[PDB]
Structure formats: C-alpha cells, structure tokens
Amino acid sequence: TNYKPVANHQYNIEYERKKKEDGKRARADKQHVLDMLFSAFEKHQYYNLKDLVDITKQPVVYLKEILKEIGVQNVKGIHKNTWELKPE
Amino acid sequence: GYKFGVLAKIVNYMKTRHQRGDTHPLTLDEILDETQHLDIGLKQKQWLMTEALVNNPKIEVIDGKYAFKPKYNVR
Amino acid sequence: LSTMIGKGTGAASFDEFGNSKYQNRRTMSSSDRAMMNAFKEITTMADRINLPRNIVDRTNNLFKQVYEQKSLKGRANDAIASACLYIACRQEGVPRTFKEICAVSRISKKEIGRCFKLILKALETSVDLITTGDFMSRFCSNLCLPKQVQMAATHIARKAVELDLVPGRSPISVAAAAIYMASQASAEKRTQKEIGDIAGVADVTIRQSYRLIYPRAPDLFPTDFKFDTPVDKLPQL
Amino acid sequence: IVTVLPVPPLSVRPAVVMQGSARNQDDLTHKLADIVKINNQLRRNEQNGAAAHVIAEDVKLLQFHVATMVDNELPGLPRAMQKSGRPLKSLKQRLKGKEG
Amino acid sequence: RGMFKNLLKEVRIYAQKFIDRGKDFNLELAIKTRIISDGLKYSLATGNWGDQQARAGVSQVLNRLTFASTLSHLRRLNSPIGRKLAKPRQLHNTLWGMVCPAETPEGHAVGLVKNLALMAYISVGSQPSPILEFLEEWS
Amino acid sequence: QAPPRYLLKFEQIYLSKPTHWERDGAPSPMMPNEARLRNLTYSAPLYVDITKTVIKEGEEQLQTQHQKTFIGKIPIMLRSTYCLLNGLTDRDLCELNECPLDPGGYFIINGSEKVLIAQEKMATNTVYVFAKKD
Amino acid sequence: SGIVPQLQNIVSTVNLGCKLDLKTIALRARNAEYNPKRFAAVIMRIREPRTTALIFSSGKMVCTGAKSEEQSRLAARKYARVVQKLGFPAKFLDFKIQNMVGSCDVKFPIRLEGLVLTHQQFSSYEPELFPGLIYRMIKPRIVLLIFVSGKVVLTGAKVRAEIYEAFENIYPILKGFRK
Amino acid sequence: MAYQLYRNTTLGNSLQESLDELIQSQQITPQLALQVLLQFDKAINAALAQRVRNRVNFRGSLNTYRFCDNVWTFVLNDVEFREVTELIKVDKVKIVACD
Amino acid sequence: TVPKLYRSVIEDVINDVRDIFLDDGVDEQVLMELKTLWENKLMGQVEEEPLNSEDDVSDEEGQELFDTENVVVCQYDKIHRSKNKWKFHLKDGIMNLNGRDYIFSKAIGDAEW
C-alpha cells in the first residue's frame, strides 16, 4: 500500500497553488521602494539582505540596483559582509 | 519612524535642485515647502541646523544660508 | 586522487580549545560532488521500489552520459536522475509507469516527462514501446492474485490490444481493465479502489475502459481457464 | 629541510591491473596527488596574495602531507586515511618490520 | 540502535531542509531505506561490527565440512583478549558444565576460543519489573 | 521548527516474511535454498507505523498516520520464528530443498552462511575490585 | 492527396520602435487587462478578427489567433491604431510572420504502433504523457500531432506554403498504416 | 489610502455633499472630511464583511470589460436578477470590483 | 431588513467616530446634527504607415461617463475564463437597483461575449 503511484505529491501541488495564488513580486517605481527603505532604516539601523527583500517585496536585482546607488557594503569579521541603508 | 528619515529626502532634494542649475542658496523653509514636510518638529529643525548641514562635505555655509558645494567636486 | 585525514589520536593532534588542527578539507570539483550527490540520490530512489543493482548501474551510465553531454544544465539534477531511472527501467524490459517513478521522487510527472523527452532528444536514441504486458507481473503481484489470473490477464490484454478493440487508450489503463475484468472471473475479487491506487489509474479511466472491453467478454478470455464465475455474471458499471 | 621533494619512479609505486578495466594506484601515488594539490594551492595563494592565516594553515597542511609521506605512525597525529578505515602505507611502513 | 539513530537523523535533516525552504514534506521520501538494510547486511557480511576501533571477527563463514563442525561453530564463544596474557587462556574452575574443557583450538587462539557445554543455556534476559514489584510488596 | 511545528512519532513495528523482488518488481517468498544459490540476502522487510502531527497558531492540528512505512530489511536467522522454515515439518523441509537436520541459527548474507559468535564481555552493573600491582 | 490543410491560428511579431507606458495604456484602452504580479505585458482583445495581442514596454507587438496572414497584418494595423489613439508615435517596421498552426483530417484511423516502430528516429509515442504521436521530421522545421482519430495538427512552419509539402510527405506514410 | 469603491455611490455622494456643505460654512477643514470619509469606508467595509449572510443570483450578457490595478469594469446588458424572494429585470448594469 | 441594516450601520458609525472626534477636539454636537442631515438627505496599401484606412472601429464610450444606470459595487475572490463565459465567485457587496437597496454575501455570475 506504500509508495503508491501518484501524478504529483500533495505538498508539491499545494506549494504550486500557493505560488500561483500569490504570484511574482511586482516591480515598482523608485520613489515607493525608497519609501519602504526609509521606513526600514527608521525601524532598525542594520539589516540582512534576505529580510530586506521580504519586507520590501521587490525583485532582488532591482533591490540591489536601487541599494547600490545609496548604500554601501561593510565588511564584518563576525558573521558576513552586509549592506548599510545609511546614504553616507 | 522619526528624526532619521527626512535627512535623506532633504539632501536628495537639494542635490537634485542643484542639478537644475540653482546655484543660489535656499532657506530651510524653501525646501520644506515643496518636500511636504510642513509638520516637521522644531527639535528636528535645530538638530538639522546644528549637525546635518554642517558636518557633511556637500553643503556650503555662506551668508547664513545653505547651498551646494560645486567647488569641492570636479566640474 | 585524494585521501582523508583520520581522527585525532593525542594532544599534538588537538589545538588550544577542543578542536583538531587538521580537517577533512576535500578537493573535489563542484562537478564531481554534484554528480556523486546525484548517484547517491539515484540509489536511494531505486531502493524505494526494490530495483536490482543492474538498473541502478544503467541509470548511473545514462546520467553520466547526459551530464557529460551537457545539454540540460537548466533542469534539476534530481529530475534528470528520475528521467534516467525511467529510461533505464524501460530499456531493461521491465518498465515502470511515470507515476511509479514520481512516487519515489520529489519531481512531478510534468517535470520528469519533459526531462525524459529532452534526454531522448539529446542522446539521439530510442526505446521500445510499452505493451500492456510488461506492466502485468507487478500490477498483479502487488494486488495478490493467483498465477492462473496472471496468465488470464496477460493473454486477455494482449488479445484486446492485438485486435484493436481499444483505440489510443494508454497501456496502463488497458492493463488495469484487464486485471479488473479477469479478477471477477476468479474467486479472488478486487474493487476499483485497490486496482486504481496500485496501478495509478483514476476510477473514471478504469470505468470507461471496462465499459469498452465488456461486450467482447467470452471471445477474449483464454480457452483453458477455470470459470469460477460465469462470463455473463460480470457486473457492468 | 625538505625544500624539493623527490618523487619516486613508477617502479616504487606501480599501478596494479584488476579484473576488467581498472587503474588502481598505489598509496604513494595518492600521497603525491595530495602533495601536488596542496602545493599548487599554496603557490596560487602566495601568487595572488591571500591572507596570512590562510598561508599559515596551507603550510601546516603541506607539512602534514610531507610528514605522512614518510611516517604514518606519527605519535599523537592523525593518520593518512584512504577511504574506508585503512591507514596509508608510508615509506617507513614499506621498510620496517616483519613484512617490510 | 545506532543505525535507527542514523535514520532518524537523516529524516530530521531532510525534513528540516524542506520546512525551512517553506513547504510541507512527504514522509515516505524522507526515509532512506538504504541505511538499515545495507548497514546490517554490511556488518553481517564483513564482520566489522560498527559503522562502515571496532570488533572484528564477530561474524564468520559457517563451517560446512562436517555436521559436527557446523554444530561446533554454531556454539562458539570468543574472548576479545588480544592475540601475552596467559591468565585468561587458562581453564578456570567456573567453566564446569558451561564450557567444554576439551574443545579449544591449538595455537595463537588457545583458550580464548571456547565452546558451550552440551547442556549449557544462555539466558536471553527478562524485564526486572515484576521482581521489583514483588520485592516492594514483600517485607 | 522552521510558525508551524512538525512532530513525528514512531509507534508500531511490523516485519513480514522474507521476500525477493525480481526485475519485474513482483514480490515472491524468498526460500533459503534460492537465497543460497542466487547469492541473495535472506532478509525480511521492516515496516513501521508513523504518526505525523502539525502544530499551528490557529489550532488546526492534523493527526495523519502513515501505516506500515518501509524502513529497510532485517536479515533473518534461519529456523527462527520469523523464518519461512519455522513450523514446517520434515517432509515440507525436504520438498523445499532444505535439510531437516540443519540446525539453523545462521544468517544468509550475499549467499554466504554467516554465523555470529558469542562475544564475551565483563559483566555490567557490578562492582569489581581488582589487584593492579603494576 | 485531395485534402488541403486549413490554418486555425497565426502568430506574428512586429516592432513599433518606440517605448510605451503600460499603466496608461491599460487605463485608456477598451479591452486591456494588466496584472503586475502575473505577467509583464498588457493583453488586448478585439472581437471582429477574434485576435489577441500583447503590449510590451519595449514596443514589440505580438498578435495571436488570426485566420490569415493578411488578416494578421490587418489585426496588427488595428492594434497599432489603438496605440496611436493614445498619441504614442508607434510605427510599423520589420513585420515578420512567426508561426501558423493547421488542423486537418485524413478520415481513417491509424495504427500508431507501426508508425513509431518504422520511424523511431523521427517519432516519439508516449501514451502516458500525451495520447497523440509527436512526429519530428527534418528538412522542414515541422512537428506533427497524429491521433488514432485520424486528425492531424501541423505546427512550426515559417510560411503558409511550408505547411503543405510536409502533409503530402506524411500522407503516403500514413497511407501505409491505415487501420 | 483605501479601497475607495463605496465613495462613488448614492451613500457616498450624500456624504460628500454633506461634507461640502460643512466645508462651505467653514466649520471643518478638508483634511477632517477626508479622515471622516476614510473612517466611513472602513466602517462600511467591516459591516458588509460581518453582517451580510445572504445570497443572490443574476444572469446576463456582456459587451464591455476591462482590468487595471485590481479593478474590474464589466458591463452587462439585459440582466435578470434572480432571487428566492424577488425577481428584478434591468436593462444595463456596470460592475466595478476590487480586492 | 434593509432599514435594520441601515440602523445597525448608523449605530456602528456613530460608535466608531467618537474617538476620532475626541482626538482633534470635535464636540459631540457635530455628530448628531450631521446624522439628522444625513437622514434628511436619504428620507493594396504598400506603404503602411497611415493607419487611417479604417474608421468606426470603436463603440460608444459614454457608458462609463454617464454612470446613470445601476452599478454593482462589491469585491471579487475568484474569476475564471473558459473560452466563452466568465465564472465569478463574488463576495460581500451592496447594490442599488432602481433606488431599492440590495445586499449579498456570495454570488455566481454568468456572462456571454
């Protein structure tokens, strides 16, 4: 009765249904993503690239493009290099 | 969020204003009018005047007013 | 050509704070490590359905050929491995249904089918067409049916396919219908749920295959078979 | 002080031929492989200016490999292990004792 | 015990890798059936008792030269003493009726390899719970 | 733990007769003589019952049960209670090409009759005072 | 042969040559749908040709569902006019036909087993994946969908003429396997 | 800064007219009027989400349809609203929906 | 039914705007009066650049402009297109049919085009 043939696994179809209900994160204008960035470094001084992507809900290449112009990466000897939201 | 976000907005606004050829200095209220920051706090104002527009190398202090620094940069 | 470093043996092996100063810093390529990960996943996949080691070796051969030929860099290695396992099973004359390989993989029927199509295109080879016969020993044995039922189902499916009673039906569906309508002819009985869940077919697929195969009931059975149930007593859905 | 490492000929480290097609290599061949890999790694790190502690650790590993070239019974040191539980047969193993 | 621990560890790694990735996981695919099968098989095949610093010679090819030989091999006892130390090799007094005083190999393994007496029985063990309950109930 | 919390519990162990899977995938009873001849391993599948539960902040617990999950094969000692030769009489043993006088008590691994020799060890859980003079 | 294929769908690409804003087009259009989270273009649909087109920000128009090449050109002109109605200076450059899909019949069942046996290097019949035989043939760029019903679908052609000679190339072969 | 769909209704029009009358009297600032509109929108949304547990049916034919920024603009003609308690006949209906 | 829903809505609205009015110093008397007023308000072209060869390829655009007829105001959950018809799963919404108000929580719609 085990390893019964099936067209697709339940978890897989559930994940595809969720992925197609939510869809891709839509690219937005520069000012509004910058507004999320402003709320972001108002909320907390330091950040991790993944959490910033989750909060902003923006394409990773577009986030990197809009963050490199104003932000810089600071090397740390404790865990990993990370981005800085301060323009200076 | 307060006391840390609008500094980026004002510096960007004055930089872009200088990009249009506005060499003349502008008062703080002049920028505040068009930046939709009429509800800015007084302590924010004095903190700006005492630190933000004097510590950065991109703002020039002349005849009391504040302007760009095109001499420092290459043109 | 590389060797490991064993566990520490004395004080000189260790460092100031509870750690060995020499470690297993392997020099494996990304490529060799990714294809070893794939062989290890292929073996795990094959042992789930008790495939013999020769099919695993053939799967490794096909996987290495695809991975050196380098035309499917964009597809998950686990999907290429699943498709390779399907091709190896089909080449040995003991094919497994796509749903059977799916059940032992994280990769869907859509994705394994596309990778199978693309592997056949890349290798410029071909595979024999599956007959409602190969899928019989398993689909029966798993359902626990006698040996006279093995012969009955094999003969009846082969005869039904031979005279083109069923147009364009997949061999799995015809095989399952044969199992259904040869099981009721014997003492051992099997309901729709068991055959459907053990062969992968839906109830509507097996029901319309049964209604297509029913009218030519007596001429399709083998001559020398014990009719534990009369031919006219088969229940029509 | 070993500054240039002698590499034994093929006679000292021959490659046996098994049933079917096999190219099974001697332990010394594997040890030479590790020596060459670590030597190339250290050379590249020194060439492109890697970190000091990286160069120090690579020197340490090179020292270990050149050590297990000769002596695999280093007291209080890990053994050069092939894959499955077998310590490598260094030169001192090839020479000393009853089967030496 | 160790190999079931390994299996549970592998299931934990697989399911963690799926949960952190943000999806439910199928239980059937998580279990690597290879582990228990080709671990027990390996241990009984090679005789190395442990993972693929372990005992050797625990499992041996059954001797099929004579029926007496098969019976003797199936009733053998091994002492892990190295093969030095004459004391464990001696025929101790407590071997009366449990171990054959005559059946030992001659050579490097004399005394260390023994055979059960003809009526020797080795207990398979039992739970000490009922003994404890009875003792507590008693005085 | 990733928020959901997943809990798996292994409860019941099942263990079927020794079986062999041919190339077709058809399970059949592995008779010990067949294992000896074809260099097979005389092993029985091991099945375990697993309960999977999910804990969510919304209190939507599931109690799903995977019954008889295959978790590998255990080699089986011949003529033991879990062998095919357990209750067979002498005539059945002869018809099955197995010696009635065979004592059993050994495994068949890759076709080799492998016997486990009892290993002596010091008794556990007992205080022992020795005479280290060295 | 005596049977002529009929084209049932046509798709073509044409470059307007000017950048466009998708939001304004969606706002000011008549049958425009645009979900930013789903897809990168504005669909547009017109009833009388029953054609559909996709508007992309780089200005490459693609049409679908036309019944004739002249009909496809007319539909493309209609979509270009819809663009111009917003004041956007679009053009009509390098109009290149891309694919037409044809459905036809042979009016007799075919034994697919022999067809894939004698043409294994060209055919790939997988009943589990898709009930129709896929026939890939070389010198034309064409793939055929064959079925036990006799229906045939032609696709992958560059021009209308190309569809024809493939059909009469497979018809004798099909005629050799009439059930 | 909300869904803003009930504003273009008879209730919304009446509320907007009342706010305009109040503003013309120099009683409240327009910002307070906008805040009142936002609160009214939230309140009516909550009331519709909570206190509505009834079903209606409708049939008709479509001629016009559009979609932009999660806003549909369907148009139906010759529409029959069928319900278990009353049947309504209407010529032309316009459907705007958001989410 | 509908008057009862209106009264419940009025009660919820007046209860909700108390904190808003007290935040900015708006007195209570502004609310009641407003409510009263609110109630009083209720009760072969080789060269293809010129595209002007066609005309009258559009329908009347005023239907959106007038908005005089009945308008459905609601929210959607699921919409499916099936080559002919649109299947709607329409959740809670309000309607104004010829002045008479209607309410619904679920609906199934059919459209032909």
UniProtKB/Swiss-Prot annotation, chain A:
One GO term of the cellular component aspect? microtubule cytoskeleton
Q: Which residues form a coiled coil?
A: none
Tell me which family the UniProt entry assigns to this protein: Belongs to the TFIIF beta subunit family.
Among the GO molecular function terms of this UniProt record, one is:
RNA polymerase II general transcription initiation factor activity
The encoding gene: GTF2F2
Q: Kindly provide the name given to this protein in its UniProt entry.
A: General transcription factor IIF subunit 2
GO biological process, any = positive regulation of transcription by RNA polymerase II
Upper lineage ranks?
Eukaryota, Metazoa, Chordata, Craniata, Vertebrata
Its source organism is Homo sapiens
Which UniProt key words apply to this protein? Answer: Acetylation, DNA-binding, Nucleus, Phosphoprotein, Transcription, Transcription regulation
From Swiss-Prot, chain B:
Q: Is Magnesium included in the keywords of this UniProt record?
A: no
**Keywords, comma-separated and alphabetical:** Acetylation, Disease variant, DNA-binding, Nucleus, Phosphoprotein, Transcription, Transcription regulation
N6-acetyllysine modification sites? 3
This protein's superkingdom? Eukaryota
Under Gene Ontology molecular function, one entry of this record is: DNA binding
Residue range(s) of DNA binding per entry: 1-75
One GO biological process term: transcription initiation at RNA polymerase II promoter
Localization, per the record, is: Nucleus
One Gene Ontology cellular component annotation held by this UniProt entry: nucleoplasm
Q: How does it assemble?
A: Tetramer of two alpha and two beta chains. Interacts with FACT subunit SUPT16H. Interacts with ATF7IP. Interacts with SND1. Part of TBP-based Pol II pre-initiation complex (PIC), in which Pol II core assembles with general transcription factors and other specific initiation factors including GTF2E1, GTF2E2, GTF2F1, GTF2F2, TCEA1, ERCC2, ERCC3, GTF2H2, GTF2H3, GTF2H4, GTF2H5, GTF2A1, GTF2A2, GTF2B and TBP; this large multi-subunit PIC complex mediates DNA unwinding and targets Pol II core to the transcription start site where the first phosphodiester bond forms.
Q: Which family does it belong to?
A: Belongs to the TFIIE beta subunit family.
Question: What is its biological role?
Answer: Recruits TFIIH to the initiation complex and stimulates the RNA polymerase II C-terminal domain kinase and DNA-dependent ATPase activities of TFIIH. Both TFIIH and TFIIE are required for promoter clearance by RNA polymerase.
Q: What is this protein called?
A: Transcription initiation factor IIE subunit beta
Name the source organism. Answer: Homo sapiens (Human)
Give me the gene this protein comes from: GTF2E2
From Swiss-Prot, chain H:
Single GO cellular component term: nucleus
CDD domains given for it? Answer: TFIIA_gamma_C (cd10014), TFIIA_gamma_N (cd10145)
- Name the residues that span the membrane: none
> Is Cell cycle a UniProt keyword of this protein?
no
Q: Which GO terms describe its biological process?
A: positive regulation of transcription by RNA polymerase II; positive regulation of transcription initiation by RNA polymerase II; RNA polymerase II preinitiation complex assembly; transcription by RNA polymerase II; transcription initiation at RNA polymerase II promoter
Please give one Gene Ontology molecular function term for this protein: RNA polymerase II general transcription initiation factor binding
Family recorded in the similarity comment = Belongs to the TFIIA subunit 2 family.
PANTHER family annotated for this entry? TRANSCRIPTION INITIATION FACTOR IIA SUBUNIT 2
Assembly mode: TFIIA is a heterodimer of the large unprocessed subunit 1 and a small subunit gamma. It was originally believed to be a heterotrimer of an alpha (p35), a beta (p19) and a gamma subunit (p12). Interacts with NCOA6 general coactivator. TFIIA forms a complex with TBP. Interacts with HSF1 (via transactivation domain).
User: Any idea what job this protein has?
Assistant: TFIIA is a component of the transcription machinery of RNA polymerase II and plays an important role in transcriptional activation. TFIIA in a complex with TBP mediates transcriptional activity.
Q: What is this protein called?
A: Transcription initiation factor IIA subunit 2
The lineage, from the top, is: Eukaryota, Metazoa, Chordata, Craniata, Vertebrata
Whichever gene encodes this chain, its name is: GTF2A2
UniProtKB/Swiss-Prot annotation, chain I:
Main function:
TFIIA is a component of the transcription machinery of RNA polymerase II and plays an important role in transcriptional activation. TFIIA in a complex with TBP mediates transcriptional activity.
The record's similarity note reads: Belongs to the TFIIA subunit 1 family.
As stated in the Swiss-Prot or TrEMBL entry, residues carrying the post-translational modification Phosphoserine are: 53, 58
Quote the gene name from the UniProt entry: GTF2A1
Compartments where found = Nucleus
Summarize the PTM comment.
Answer: The alpha and beta subunits are postranslationally produced from the precursor form by TASP1. The cleavage promotes proteasomal degradation.
Q: Which organism is it from?
A: Homo sapiens (Human)
InterPro entries xref list = TFIIA_asu/bsu, TFIIA_b-brl
Q: What is this protein called?
A: Transcription initiation factor IIA subunit 1
**Residues that coordinate or bind DNA:** 80-81
Q: Which Pfam family is one of those matched by this entry?
A: TFIIA
Domain of life, source organism:
Eukaryota
Q: How does it assemble?
A: TFIIA is a heterodimer of the large unprocessed subunit 1 and a small subunit gamma. It was originally believed to be a heterotrimer of an alpha (p35), a beta (p19) and a gamma subunit (p12). TFIIA forms a complex with TBP.
